[PDB]
Design a protein around this nucleic acid. Structure first.
Ligand SMILES: Nc1ncnc2c1ncn2[C@@H]1O[C@@H]2COP(=O)(O)O[C@H]3[C@@H](O)[C@H](n4cnc5c(N)ncnc54)O[C@@H]3COP(=O)(O)O[C@H]2[C@H]1O
Ligand SMILES: Nc1ncnc2c1ncn2[C@@H]1O[C@@H]2COP(=O)(O)O[C@H]3[C@@H](O)[C@H](n4cnc5c(N)ncnc54)O[C@@H]3COP(=O)(O)O[C@H]2[C@H]1O
Ligand SMILES: [K+]
Ligand SMILES: [Mg+2]
Ligand SMILES: [Mg+2]
Ligand SMILES: [Mg+2]
Ligand SMILES: [Mg+2]
Ligand SMILES: [Mg+2]
Length: 90
RNA sequence: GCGCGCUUAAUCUGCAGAGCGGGGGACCCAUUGCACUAGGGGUGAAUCCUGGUAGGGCGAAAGCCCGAAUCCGUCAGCUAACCUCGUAAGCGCGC
């Protein structure tokens, strides 16, 4: 719940492949600001989740506030704030 | 060495078939998971608590024992089709 450069999204449709999911997430979130990276994994623990890392925290906050609850692949996205991502911390 | 047996998927036929087993792997169902570095998982009865113990083997029974080892490599839920490998080894009696 603490503001971060990286936003954490879950409740995502697990049938959607990594490439397509990342492409769609970039498509939707790039309008809020420059995206540093998008981490997606389909492992047992990490599936249904994604990490969108923004260049600016303001972008992260606006994206989160704006896309909170968005119908994405027939499921409402659940968005919270990320610890800092390795790319940012470094 | 051979004849019965025993744990085990570990046995038969002339490296390969048959038989017996292990793992991956859709739809369906279940899973809401804070990652970018031991974690997660598989064979087996062999797991846990600080000698006990879950769980297993022989035995009609009472009783006697095991309660090991090791591997995949950061990854594996269920799962037809399908893809794959294993068929090592350790003993008890007799001649
Ligand atoms: N899969 C398993 N799960 C749990 N526990 C297991 C197990 N396999 C074996 N055990 C236990 O550990 C001991 C190991 O015996 P092993 O098979 O080396 O050696 C055995 C066996 O090779 C042989 N044996 C046992 N019963 C036999 C029988 N009825 N006929 C012929 N030979 C027998 O003589 C030895 C006597 O063993 P014993 O039964 O006193 O003790 C056995 C058994 O109690
Ligand atoms: N789903 C999974 N998740 C995580 N790790 C997994 C896994 N599946 C397999 N592994 C591990 O990786 C190896 C893969 O070889 P595979 O299981 O084909 O090779 C196995 C298997 O094909 C066969 N096997 C194992 N247990 C068997 C059994 N009970 N009956 C018949 N064959 C068996 O012999 C080999 C034994 O070697 P081992 O099991 O040490 O070697 C296994 C195991 O250590
Ligand atoms: K088991
Ligand atoms: Mg062969
Ligand atoms: Mg099994
Ligand atoms: Mg599976
Ligand atoms: Mg038996
Ligand atoms: Mg899977």
């Amino acid at each position: 719940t603490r503001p971060n450069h990286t936003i954490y999204i879950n409740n995502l449709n697990e049938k959607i492949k990594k490439d397509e999911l990342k492409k769609s997430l970039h498509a939707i979130f790039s309008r809020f600001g420059q995206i540093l990276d998008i981490l997606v994994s389909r492992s047992l623990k990490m599936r249904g989740q994604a990490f969108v890392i923004f260049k600016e925290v303001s972008s992260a906050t606006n994206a989160l506030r704006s896309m909170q609850g968005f119908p994405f692949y027939d499921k409402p996205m659940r968005i919270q704030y990320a610890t800092d991502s390795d790319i940012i911390a470094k």
